Amino acid sequence: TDRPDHIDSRVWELSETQEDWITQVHGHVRRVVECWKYTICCLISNMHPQYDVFKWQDRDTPDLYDNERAVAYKVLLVSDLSDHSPTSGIYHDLAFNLEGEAEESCALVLRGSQLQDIKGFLCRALEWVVSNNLTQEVVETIS
Amino acid sequence: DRPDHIDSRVWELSETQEDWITQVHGHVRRVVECWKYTICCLISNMHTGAPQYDVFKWQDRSTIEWICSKKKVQYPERDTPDLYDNERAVAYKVLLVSDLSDHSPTSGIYHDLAFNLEGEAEESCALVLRGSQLQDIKGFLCRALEWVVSNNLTQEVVETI
């Protein structure tokens, strides 16, 4: 249970007090998964700023917001893409595979530039998972 | 208990939204609200490619409040619109009405999207929605009208409008 290579220094340091990790089941992993999601949020908000990131700012909050088009989004991780019904009418879902693939609604909104970063970021994290065979602890966390 | 033309998820979302058992026509009213909600979903599948509409109906209260702050917009908790067009910065309410002909707006803080039992759209609702969206609505309300006629529920439904 150490900060992985693929996670950013700032991300990990910011994540520490955002949720009380020791108390939870798969607490180190749950932190890492949430760190994937924040990383995704940052990757997406490198358009110009088009997106503001609300996750882990300084209670019922979205993960980012499009300043131009005035739309809120929530980043999700899913195991089955086809089986997906919106969780919210207001915070629109941006769902992805562990492999990196994005859902129909997700690919209509995001630019290739942002997807290719995320798929790059996700396989590198999936590699880290598979290195320590943490597959079921991650798949459970997605339920 | 649910009609097959209503989706399972919509049905289970409606469960807690109002105290149906206490009402006369309570089951029929639940179904009518599901129609309105189902219609909100059928409208919001469009995109500019960012989502065109946000749906407020049957959402958590604190989320409705959060976005209206960001969009510098304000509706009473009693009268909250069903969806919001992110393109035009204008809000709507899905109404079901028997008489479309001489329809008068319900509000001045949002607009009405009025529909028939046959699925026909009110003049002003027709102006707003694309043909793509009306086919889907009228097709859904045909399947809804079938269920109504199959269970001889036509009077109850007309009365509760």
Residue numbers in the entry:
A (entry chain F): 2 to 49, 55 to 64, 82 to 166
B (entry chain E): 3 to 50, 53 to 165
Question: How does the study describe this entry?
Answer:
The three largest gene segments of the Thogotoviruses, THOV, DHOV and JOSV are homologous to those of IAV and code for the heterotrimeric polymerase. In this paper we present the atomic structures of the putative PB2 cap binding and 627 domains of THOV and the putative PA N-terminal endonuclease domains of THOV and DHOV. Despite very low sequence homologies, all domains have similar folds to those of the corresponding IAV polymerase domains. However, the critical active site residues in the putative cap binding and endonuclease domains are not conserved in THOV and DHOV and, contrary to the case of IAV polymerase, neither domain shows the expected in vitro biochemical activity.
The corresponding construct (residues 1 to 169) was cloned, expressed, purified and crystallized. THOV PA-Nter comprises four principle β-strands surrounded by six α-helices. Comparison of the two independent molecules in the asymmetric unit of crystal form 1 shows that the region 72–89, including helix α3 and the following loop, is in two very distinct orientations. Interestingly, this asymmetry is also observed in crystal form 2 of THOV PA-Nter in which there are six molecules in the asymmetric unit. These are arranged as three asymmetric dimers, each similar to that observed in form 1, but for the chain in which the 72–89 element is dissociated from the body of the protein, the electron density for the element is lacking, presumably due to mobility. Interestingly, the significant difference in thermal stability behaviour of the THOV and DHOV domains correlates with the enhanced plasticity and much poorer diffracting crystals of THOV PA-Nter. For THOV and DHOV PA-Nter the putative active site is more like an extended groove and furthermore, is positively charged. Our structural and biochemical results therefore strongly suggest that THOV and DHOV PA-Nter domains neither bind divalent cations nor are active endonucleases.
